[PDB]
Amino acid sequence: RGGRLCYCRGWICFCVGR
Structure with a gap:
């Protein structure tokens, strides 16, 4: 998940x- 997902x-x- 990494931490923060920017789309x-x-x-x-x-x-x-998260």
Whole structure:
């Protein structure tokens, strides 16, 4: 899982941390 996952999809990018 790493820790924080940032997903960028086009002109919007969100990132979630656990």
